[PDB]
Symmetry: D8
Subunit: 65 residues, 16 copies
């Protein structure tokens, strides 16, 4: 899956290739944004870690499986 | 069909083709606005939007 | 009527052609901005729906009938 | 005659020709500033402005 | 006096020629910014009125007499 | 001598030549930071700054 | 190895080469996010970041 | 030491050459940001004074000794 | 009816209501883009004088 | 179906829904960009006309049929 | 009456009130843009002079009489 | 797999998932940069038609 | 009295108080725009040396 | 090791980790910028390819070995 | 004393304190801008060197002696 | 010691600490501005390769 993260007050998206399923990523993002844990972590297919300050997320776009 | 989402403090709109009706999309947006809006396009792409960062949602003519 | 909506922190206006009267649009906007309903909906002459987060409205310009 | 409205976080001014007097426009602006300002131009265009997003209002010389 | 007003989150200054003395303008601005009246009014030498939302003032520069 | 004031959310610095000492200017800035800072340049130009909009003040080498 | 820090309302990332492991950097970031994050690069440069101004931290593949 | 200060909502860094040690500068910055004194002062090798509104600091980068 | 003109290196579009047909506006724009001036008038008689080299795009709405 | 046009020196894309096939649009765009003089003209599914100054085109993205 | 001048690579329009007729202003602007060399000069109703570098004109909007 | 295209005077990158090999994409870009059009297709068949003069960079990810 | 100079690709105007007449300033600007340098002095003797190619506009206020 | 590429008219640098020596990268960059036509191509330590339009290069910073 | 240099396509001025007279600086700037090729070089009162690419100069403001 | 390079159309300066003298840096810049490449090295051996056409200014600090 291509995953794209829009960051508030920035025109540049975080984009990476995920090895997880769309439902897995959706659940991660949804749960992070609703239980206010402050930090959302998403890891790409090579093991790069993206640690995102949840309050600065504008949107997450999740591609097709 | 076409849905455009304006994001606060950003010049780029999220634009996608929806298989839902205008009233269906409107209900999702309306309910969210009164912290997360989730919309799916006709191909199954998922858009998870922080409601506080929504400037507007434009919903095109049905078909 | 041409209707133009200025969105906070954006140089680009929402502009559309309305089939409603200027007084109708004025009342819609005025009531939305004063009873804090969170959402203002305006629909153009073709039935395009603009759902606007009322707090992000800078201004609404309403043209002559 | 000419009225210019500066909008916060925007480089574009709202500019129109008013048929009201400077004191009339000033009273509307002053009252609003202390959430909505409504002004009409000489042709009947309506400007509905969110008072919190007003940076300034410049009112030109009367006539 | 040339008077220049810096507006928050804008690179463009309001600039006008004042017929008032520097001390007069200083007192107007100082009093407005300290008694929180919401509105500062400054009028230029031709009678143009600048009505400024006091919270959106970054600075006022007042020239020499 | 040279004083530069950085204003939040603006690329333009206020720059002027001061006749005061670095410690004098520093005291004015320090006191203000802990809603208005007033500084005068060597020619008597007055700078009235909203303290909340100050990003930094750079004070050059004395003389 | 490569660490990139996105700063809110800024187009420029802080980028440096770390001698720490991904889990070590992640722990520092995670702990800070829940007002100051301090990170040191492989040469001993110190990055002191206001946690409220962190948009993201990207941690590259270990080695 | 080169010291670079990132200011919130500005792309331009304050950069200067310090005569202090990296640990000295780190302690100054750390203490200022944690005891909320409102003002951080850093002085360069020539005696230029940088008075920074602590809330507007995004980051401080401190070079190698 | 609605005409929108995108201007190069500017985020603000010129938007007006035209009393002309879509083909009328299209042909004016096409012809201008091949003295360096495009002139368009709106339904109220406002005149838009556009430096053709600074036109990024013109969007023309549906007729009537 | 969806066509997105990137315009040079602008962060905002022109986006519309096309009733033409991807190959049809590709041919029109390719021909316009290779006789790089004047105009690329496209019509959307409702009959709106997009007249694009070919020299100001950064990219055209054509979606799946 | 109202004349608005768009300047290339700037979001801010020059706006003034003219005492000339729309046809008068149109002729001046048209002639300036077609002998595209140097200056378009317009005077407002108070006698302020606007000297515009013709090559930096994006558009001129002329209002209703 | 991931291809990112930087466009001159724009902060937004074109990013897509390619089904082609790194060398295939590299050679297309290299050849285009020497009719002023680069055409790339993603794994779903989306077509990207890029004005070669407006390309700042192309980043090509690791194969597979 | 007030003179405002718009500089290309910049949101900040040069603004100063002139001791010259409107026609004096107008003729200086006009003549410069036809060595690539415009020089203007304000009422205090500040000198503004402007690269004529970077002038977008000059606004000249009412006399006195 | 770290290579940073500044791109004209963009605030965002391309940054990657190189497995080549500083002299190797310097020679590649120098040659590309002096036969200033087409492409500078660099590979990072993981095999990612950076194809840079040489005319749009503002600077290349090459870190310490 | 104060010299301010406006750089094309940048909102930030170069500002420094000069020990030279206004006429001296004016002559240097005038000559540089009229043999418009390469460099304008100015030194401040502390001996800092400002090397300015003459073609990228928008304006130079020279303060009162 | 401190060298600052302003890059055209960018708000971010390249800033580094130089081990060279002011005249050494000045002459390098001057000579480059008259193959389109300026190369400068900092005190740690970082290399800055600058496209000379994109240089707006170079500020050179006081010696030592």
């Amino acid at each position: 899956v291509e995953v794209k993260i829009g960051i508030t007050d920035s025109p540049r998206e975080l984009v990476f290739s995920s090895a997880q399923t769309p439902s897995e990523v959706e659940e991660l993002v949804s749960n992070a944004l609703r239980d206010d844990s402050g930090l959302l972590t998403l890891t790409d297919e090579r093991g790069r870690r993206f640690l995102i300050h949840t309050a600065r997320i504008a949107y997450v776009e999740i591609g097709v499986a």
